[model samples]
Target chain A: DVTPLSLGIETLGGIMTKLITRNTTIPTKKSQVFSTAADGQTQVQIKVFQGEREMATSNKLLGQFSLVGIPPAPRGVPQVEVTFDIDANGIVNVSARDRGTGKEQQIVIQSSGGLSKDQIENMIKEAEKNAAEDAKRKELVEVINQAE
Target chain B: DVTPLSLGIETLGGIMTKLITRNTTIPTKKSQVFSTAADGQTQVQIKVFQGEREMATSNKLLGQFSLVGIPPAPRGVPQVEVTFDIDANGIVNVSARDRGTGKEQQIVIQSSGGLSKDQIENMIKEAEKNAAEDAKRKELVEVINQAE
Candidate 1:
């Protein structure tokens, strides 16, 4: 399955999520526009989170950004879209925009301060348990490449 | 200049240039196919890097992955495509595929023990100096959003 990944922002009524699933392909993206719940909401705070939990609080809070000066609108009206893209270098770049007032915020969650050498080595070894399965997938992919 | 972020794989040359520039958009991706320089090359090493240096050695080495079982081929023949993606929480997801043998590898470069709270705060403040320019871009984007 290549063991894909997922991402989304936290919001009211729970976490406002992007459509992409937690485990999917790399170089993939999840982008969706969200609506405001209140009038005169000048600031849209987007809390970026990651994890498989159902609740917002359960997940890891990676980062956040604020969209300011959004043009006032009725509750449940104005749109504030947030986008999540995980580039190749594993760099996290997130952007939020206020549809009403032309305000936008871009945030790069510096680093999660990820794993140590031993941890990473362990992960790769664990994944190797499916080595035979991965090899089969490769054989299939090679067939596709030849056609093109 | 938006001082946009950039991410790329370290290949035959210094980072094969930028796929996404800084201060532009988020959740973007850059993918490119590469060629091997030797026959029976079973592994394709992708060293994820970041920074403005001209040499791959100078930049921060975020992480790496090797694509095994690559179908042997003459130099500059078999194709190995590397794709980079960043999610909202700033997780780097790198996937490399061997088009000839159908072999693929997925890499997740964990952070280098990220920064402290104080370090993060200092960065945001330093970025504030260019707040006006960022605001201008936001205004421009809002104008486009309205048109649609």
Candidate 2:
């Protein structure tokens, strides 16, 4: 079974609510809805973090994005939706679109601490070579069985 | 020669000013004064970042601490004194204290990369073993030189 990817938000007081978790299968999407904390708040800064910590402050910050030009409304009247999607190659894509206006913004999150594309390709080639050698060993065992 | 540790703040638009920087000796301290961007702002959230990057976005965010209970004033009135002190071990300690109320907050900056304490100890042990081997080889060379 595939595990779900972990995602969450840190509130003003450092409170964290996890939306998704790790070891989850790829191509997973999660959405979080939040209300405006104050009136005339034209811009909402969303801090995106990724990690296994219970507190958002302890997690590694993936990136930060902002949603701007909201229609001025009373505090807690306007709602914003934040969506996070992880693709097959374990890349995270984040998009925040205003629920009322439908205006959207998106960003692709890249891993800074993992194997590069060429390194991954080299790993695949090494695995193929090892598998070929194992296949030859299995064939020799089969021949001995036939002779017996 | 001692390396100086530089510190600074990045405003909303990615502009940065050097409060302190590298090639200077440790146990050094410097302070930068900042103010609220808006009127009646009771609290100011300060994101402290450290590195050799010219842009604040490229620099590594060591940590963040906030100053609260500021006297409500117009934009640029409530000044905050941010002090940064780096020790000899290359660890940085930051404090943001309110000039008016004297309320202060601090956090240590930790690197996300680098080996753990135990790993560093193992590396030291390996280095000592290599040094002992080198000493034996040096002794043999000296004896051969004498015989020749």
Candidate 3:
């Protein structure tokens, strides 16, 4: 069976910055660049989650950890590269590196219960149900989101 | 021993909003009101951290969880009350409640190795050292900050 749901990390403004989209084949890898969202941020926490929700907090939290030792800098100044690797067994490994200094942190997610296929299906159905509501309301008034 | 450092949750813009300050006696409880930082937001994540740093990411993350069932509403319109209760044993219980609907979520943080006394002393010293640096720079330029 294919990966049933999206896998991502929480980012600036509580946004779900997805690295692995649903239904992708297993044994795959993906990487993306992120930066400090706050000035003088020397530490960054990787809050991993799974789901299709636009907001990270709305999704199921798998696990989290912090990476420290980045030199203090202004927002969006330091480049951080995060990578997600999934093996044929469906085990997922998530890691991040301070691209400049090479400092790193990573986690191995067992993918147990990883949200049953049935659950993902129901989640998608609920998301679709809310899609029109969100769009209609957004067209009515824009938004500004936030963190955990 | 007392609570050695400030305890807080990540809030809008990744700010460290403290609920229990450093050196406080145990078996104490404190509560505060928070609101949706985004429009039509239905879930809120409580990211607990401990430190003196102004930004939550700069602090030590203890643990975290999400509070669901918040009725979707405009930013800052839905009120959620978060409380921090610490017993004499130093075990901390954090709970969040939707003031309107009574929906809730809670977590118990075992105060094990909860940062050594020496560690806390060193942390405060380092914070003091950075105080002037941050202030001198802030006078140099105001700051804007973030999450996850």
Candidate 4:
């Protein structure tokens, strides 16, 4: 079975808000809302991280992306929604959207860092072989249960 | 690295078909399609379960949901496509779609009766610590080899 969790990025008064305490089930999801830090700011960069830390900069940086092309507005007026969905195996999926326009962007979190799709597939094959063996053992135990 | 698999539900000859063998890794997906026994059926209740069982009744029932709004058709005309996707972590995701009307529904397989997230996280940390210590021991062995 897998657990999924959600995470988010927040900023307050020009200072980036770090995730201080997040209670997410493994394979969990969470969302956070933020407003533009400055008037007429066309761009906002979101730095996502994981692990236990006060400052996001100190944590393991997962990925960074930006939202752009926002209409000029006063600081704290334009809202952005950030959603983090982490699956049971600790893989993350991030989605950021402008609340005004409803436009969104997303990215999938990969664990092996820089591995390509084919390489990941190969690794999965190896892992599945072991997993199948483990499943078989469990199956055998269930058969014993039936006998009882 | 993780692998992806496709999942779904199937109905055969008025009986609910359950997953007998799970597909993971090189094998993409496997399913047994079933048909509703009644004519002019508008919906089918797909009950997904997980576990090793010779009989569907003996398996651990995970969740139950309905595939609704099926076009009224003769029995055996409405086919339910059940697909299974297993990822790198050996967890499965199940989905159901009607071949007649093209309606789709899906749900994730979560370890509902398993360990809590905190327990799993602590165990992972312990394993990592042990691995780091093992690497240090290997370095000492390398130093002795260099002296020889």
In terms of lDDT, the best-performing candidate is 3
Using Cα atoms with residue i matched to residue i, what is each candidate's TM-score against the true structure?
0.37, 0.37, 0.48, 0.34
Stretches of model 2 off by over 4 angstroms after superposition: A1-5, A111-148, B1-148
The C-alpha stretches of model 4 lying farther than 4 A from their native spots are: A1-23, A111-148, B1-148
How far does residue A52 in candidate 3 sit from its true spot (Å)?
0.3
- Per-residue lDDT of model 3, residues A1-148, tens digit only: 5678888888655656678998888889998877765567677788888877766777789888777877877655677888889998778888988888999999999654656768889987876676444422211111123453
Residues B1-148, candidate 4: write the lDDT tens digits: 2222112232221112334333234324455444443345567777665432222333446666777887765444566676665554545566778787889887766432244557445534554454322222100000001111
RMSD of 3: 13.2
TM-score of 2: 0.37
Interface RMSD to the true structure, each candidate: 20.0, 37.0, 12.1, 27.8
Candidate 2, position B103, lDDT: 84
Docking class of 4: incorrect
Better of 1 and 3 by lDDT: 3
Candidate 3's displacement at residue B11, Å, is 14
Candidate lDDT (C-alpha), each: 0.52, 0.53, 0.71, 0.47
lDDT of 2 by residue, B1-42 (tens): 233234666542343345676456666778766655433556
* lDDT (C-alpha) at residue B87 in model 4: 51
TM-score of chain B of each: 0.66, 0.65, 0.85, 0.57
